[PDB]
């Protein structure tokens, strides 16, 4: 019983360790995107004011 409970907790712990990665490594590409979208926003803004 103890051996089985420990294996079952062990696999769950692997999944916790992996999803702590998945969440923040998604969050990092999103951190990039959030700012690289602002680059486009402000570049188009600059170009519009200069054109006007």
């Amino acid at each position: 019983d103890l051996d089985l409970a420990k294996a079952s907790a062990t696999d769950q712990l692997k999944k916790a360790k992996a999803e702590a990665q998945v969440i923040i490594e998604q969050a990092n590409k999103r951190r990039s995107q959030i700012l690289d979208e602002a680059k486009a926003e402000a570049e188009q803004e600059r170009t519009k004011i200069v054109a006007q």
Binding site: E45, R46, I49
Partner: protein, 52 residues
């Protein structure tokens, strides 16, 4: 985007000044060639000799 427009104001101002400044001298040439055809030449040639 603001300095980028300031530079353009300066550059357009200069572009215009150039044209006015060359047309000035073209006009002076023709005007001078219309009006010194008389004894006015005798004054010019006598003017420098007093300083020559």
């Amino acid at each position: 985007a603001q300095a980028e427009i300031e530079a353009e104001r300066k550059r357009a101002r200069e572009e215009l000044r150039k044209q006015v400044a060359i047309l000035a001298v073209a006009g002076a040439e023709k005007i001078i060639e219309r009006s010194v055809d008389e004894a006015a030449n005798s004054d010019i040639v006598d003017k420098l000799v007093a300083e020559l």
